Amino acid sequence: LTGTGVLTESNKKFLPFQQFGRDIADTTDAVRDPQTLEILDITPCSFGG
Amino acid sequence: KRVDFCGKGYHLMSFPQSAPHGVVFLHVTYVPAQEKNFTTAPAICHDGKAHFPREGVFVSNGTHWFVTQRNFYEPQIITTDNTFVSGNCDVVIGIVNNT
Amino acid sequence: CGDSTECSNLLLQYGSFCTQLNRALTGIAVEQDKNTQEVFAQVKQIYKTPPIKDFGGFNFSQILPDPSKPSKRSFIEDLLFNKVTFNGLTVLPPLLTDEMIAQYTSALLAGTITSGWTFGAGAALQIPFAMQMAYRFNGIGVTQNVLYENQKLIANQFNSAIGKIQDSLSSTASALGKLQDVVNQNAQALNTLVKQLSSNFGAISSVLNDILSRLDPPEAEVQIDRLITGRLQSLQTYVTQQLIRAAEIRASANLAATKMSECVLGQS
Amino acid sequence: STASALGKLQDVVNQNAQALNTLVKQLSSNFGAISSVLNDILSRLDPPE
Amino acid sequence: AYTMSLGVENSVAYSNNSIAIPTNFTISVTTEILPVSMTKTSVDCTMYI
Numbered sequence: 051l052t053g054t055g056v057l058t059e060s061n062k063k064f065l066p067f068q069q070f071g072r073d074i075a076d077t078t079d080a081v082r083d084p085q086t087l088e089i090l091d092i093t094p095c096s097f098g099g
Numbered sequence: 100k101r102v103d104f105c106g107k108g109y110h111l112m113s114f115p116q117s118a119p120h121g122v123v124f125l126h127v128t129y130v131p132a133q134e135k136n137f138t139t140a141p142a143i144c145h146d147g148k149a150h151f152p153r154e155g156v157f158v159s160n161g162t163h164w165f166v167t168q169r170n171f172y173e174p175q176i177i178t179t180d181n182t183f184v185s186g187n188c189d190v191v192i193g194i195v196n197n198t
Numbered sequence: 199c200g201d202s203t204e205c206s207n208l209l210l211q212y213g214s215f216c217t218q219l220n221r222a223l224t225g226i227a228v229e230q231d232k233n234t235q236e237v238f239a240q241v242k243q244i245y246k247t248p249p250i251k252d253f254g255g256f257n258f259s260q261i262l263p264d265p266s267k268p269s270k271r272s273f274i275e276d277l278l279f280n281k282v283t284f285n286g287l288t289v290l291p292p293l294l295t296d297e298m299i300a301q302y303t304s305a306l307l308a309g310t311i312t313s314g315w316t317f318g319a320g321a322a323l324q325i326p327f328a329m330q331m332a333y334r335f336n337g338i339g340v341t342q343n344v345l346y347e348n349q350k351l352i353a354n355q356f357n358s359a360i361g362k363i364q365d366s367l368s369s370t371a372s373a374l375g376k377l378q379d380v381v382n383q384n385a386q387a388l389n390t391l392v393k394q395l396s397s398n399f400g401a402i403s404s405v406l407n408d409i410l411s412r413l414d415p416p417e418a419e420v421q422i423d424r425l426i427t428g429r430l431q432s433l434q435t436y437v438t439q440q441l442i443r444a445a446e447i448r449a450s451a452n453l454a455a456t457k458m459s460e461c462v463l464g465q466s
Numbered sequence: 467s468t469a470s471a472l473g474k475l476q477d478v479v480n481q482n483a484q485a486l487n488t489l490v491k492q493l494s495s496n497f498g499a500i501s502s503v504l505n506d507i508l509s510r511l512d513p514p515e
Numbered sequence: 516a517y518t519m520s521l522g523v524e525n526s527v528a529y530s531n532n533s534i535a536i537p538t539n540f541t542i543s544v545t546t547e548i549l550p551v552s553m554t555k556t557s558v559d560c561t562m563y564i
């Protein structure tokens with residue numbers, strides 16, 4: 051799941067068999083770490099004019 | 100007559116001028132100024148009847164009542180030829196006594 | 199490109215497609231700001247209504263602002279606001295905030311209640327509301343004679359109509375069709391633009407990293423060319439649709455400005 | 467005396483001139499090819515490519 | 516940098532038996548500029564492409 055972003059802590063709950071989530075238009079929005087089985091979050095580090 | 104179509108104010112006339120790829124209008128407009136205060140009443144009770152103004156508005160300067168045009172202060176005394184009658188005055192809210 | 203080097207290098211030799219691409223969007227945004235300014239900024243001062251209100255019997259409490267609410271918006275505005283609802287794309291805030299728009303509308307409405315139409319030409323002139331209605335009957339053929347003899351009945355009809363429209367807006371939905379349609383169209387356009395980033399366009403994959411990671415530049419460049427052509431086509435189509443829609447919205451805004459100028463600031 | 471009074475006509479003229487200029491400048495783009503001029507590529511190749 | 520002011524705030528001295536009538540006038544001449552045309556352009560294919 052290669053990609054760049056900033057990883058924070060979240061609160062949503064995965065069912066015991068998902069690996070990662072997404073919200074709409076097929077963009078990854080949360081990942082479960084394969085070590086501690088905790089739900090992370092993904093936010094693009096800011097940019098602008 | 101359509102408001103604010105060409106000119107801020109009351110339109111009078113206009114002049115066109117050319118420009119390399121367009122037109123330039125010079126809108127002449129009338130704008131009132133130097134306002135003042137008065138006291139108004141929507142009708143006048145005389146002999147029970149209720150006179151209304153044909154065109155204009157009633158005003159007063161403290162002692163005397165006048166009828167004026169609505170866009171330029173010009174007071175004229177009240178006479179039976181610029182007012183018209185309609186019924187008697189007990190249903191109108193704002194009547195005032197005068198002659 | 200999605201923050202890649204060789205993609206940027208390949209896109210560089212395509213000339214300047216993107217300078218005017220950004221120019222068009224900037225012009226569109228400036229156009230929206232100008233639209234809002236020309237629609238609402240019809241007045242020079244900011245008028246206010248007196249605390250004591252005796253408008254011959256007419257009742258404006260449903261449209262006049264109330265200081266209790268934090269937003270200072272009236273009841274009908276509350277009903278309307280309640281009823282209706284990152285991949286290099288950004289959204290910018292409007293220059294005017296909703297509070298200032300509400301202030302503009304409140305100033306307009308207080309002026310037309312207390313001054314009449316005279317505040318659109320020069321300085322606002324006070325005029326008691328009842329004997330202002332007698333100036334609007336006179337402009338449709340009916341003499342003023344009528345109004346001063348049916349004042350209470352007219353006031354009751356107006357209040358009942360206000361209550362009826364209040365309830366019709368409150369309960370029945372799907373009345374604010376056009377704004378909802380505009381919002382849905384914009385959202386659909388953005389969503390379908392976003393979803394195009396998952397298309398092969400005749401290439402081997404929709405992800406740059408994999409195609410550059412298991413190949414070599416000699417033909418990875420060709421695959422990137424296919425991706426670039428597809429994405430450029432999609433972006434150009436999106437920009438053209440945006441331009442057409444902006445033209446339609448500008449026509450509607452001009453119509454709204456004319457309506458505000460001719461029916462609010464005067465009798466048509 | 468005052469300048470910048472004739473804004474709209476000047477903007478129209480500038481828009482047209484800029485459109486023409488950017489159309490002209492597109493002639494110097496490789497478009498992914500080996501050159502932006504036809505004579506040399508015809509003179510140093512064969513018809514196939 | 517500051518917060519925008521929409522204009523000077525005044526309260527019209529509303530009452531129910533008071534009017535204000537102008538006593539003088541002014542005449543104002545204001546300009547308005549509208550484009551009506553743009554330069555006609557023609558393009559030849561073979562010469563350009």
Ligand SMILES: *[C@@H]1O[C@H](CO)[C@@H](O[C@@H]2O[C@H](CO)[C@@H](O)[C@H](O)[C@H]2NC(C)=O)[C@H](O)[C@H]1NC(C)=O
Pocket residue numbers: 084085086087
């Ligand atoms: C793999 O990850 C770690 C590696 O040791 C282990 O899980 C943790 O193990 C440490 C001590 O070895 C404990 O203190 C933690 O409480 C463990 N956490 C979890 C979430 O297990 C274990 O070997 C493996 N864990 C998993 C989940 O596969």
Ligand SMILES: *[C@@H]1O[C@H](CO)[C@@H](O[C@@H]2O[C@H](CO)[C@@H](O)[C@H](O)[C@H]2NC(C)=O)[C@H](O)[C@H]1NC(C)=O
Pocket residue numbers: 134135136526527528535
């Ligand atoms: C007409 O009279 C009203 C009330 O007398 C004037 O409104 C007030 O004028 C005084 C001037 O001494 C101000 O201090 C008040 O602030 C005004 N009232 C409000 C609510 O602002 C009004 O100015 C008079 N009209 C003219 C043209 O002089």
Ligand SMILES: *[C@@H]1O[C@H](CO)[C@@H](O[C@@H]2O[C@H](CO)[C@@H](O)[C@H](O)[C@H]2NC(C)=O)[C@H](O)[C@H]1NC(C)=O
Pocket residue numbers: 160161162163
């Ligand atoms: C209100 O206006 C009336 C009419 O102009 C004034 O009445 C006359 O005023 C003049 C002086 O301005 C006197 O010479 C006359 O004797 C007055 N009466 C008549 C019948 O002409 C009145 O003075 C004005 N009052 C105020 C307070 O301005």
Ligand SMILES: *[C@@H]1O[C@H](CO)[C@@H](O[C@@H]2O[C@H](CO)[C@@H](O)[C@H](O)[C@H]2NC(C)=O)[C@H](O)[C@H]1NC(C)=O
Pocket residue numbers: 192193252254531532
């Ligand atoms: C204009 O407003 C004033 C004050 O709001 C009204 O004066 C009141 O008149 C009623 C009877 O008409 C009296 O019982 C009150 O005592 C008056 N109030 C004061 C403060 O004296 C006046 O009637 C209104 N006029 C119109 C035409 O609406």
Ligand SMILES: *[C@@H]1O[C@H](CO)[C@@H](O[C@@H]2O[C@H](CO)[C@@H](O)[C@H](O)[C@H]2NC(C)=O)[C@H](O)[C@H]1NC(C)=O
Pocket residue numbers: 195196
């Ligand atoms: C205006 O004039 C009328 C008529 O002169 C007044 O009405 C009379 O008032 C007196 C005293 O209040 C009563 O005794 C009469 O019954 C009333 N009617 C008639 C036909 O005389 C009225 O009060 C005056 N003032 C106003 C504000 O209308």
Ligand SMILES: *[C@@H]1O[C@H](CO)[C@@H](O[C@@H]2O[C@H](CO)[C@@H](O)[C@H](O)[C@H]2NC(C)=O)[C@H](O)[C@H]1NC(C)=O
Pocket residue numbers: 257258259
């Ligand atoms: C204008 O209309 C509003 C809406 O009906 C009136 O507010 C109502 O007032 C009564 C009695 O004061 C209350 O029982 C209602 O609950 C109020 N309605 C709402 C929605 O709160 C208001 O009184 C009317 N204006 C006047 C001068 O009576």
Ligand SMILES: *[C@@H]1O[C@H](CO)[C@@H](O[C@@H]2O[C@H](CO)[C@@H](O)[C@H](O)[C@H]2NC(C)=O)[C@H](O)[C@H]1NC(C)=O
Pocket residue numbers: 538539540541
């Ligand atoms: C209405 O306003 C005009 C100016 O817009 C006044 O005309 C001026 O009057 C003063 C004194 O009489 C002269 O010194 C000026 O030269 C006049 N101006 C012009 C352009 O001629 C006029 O007096 C005002 N009317 C009233 C009744 O006060």
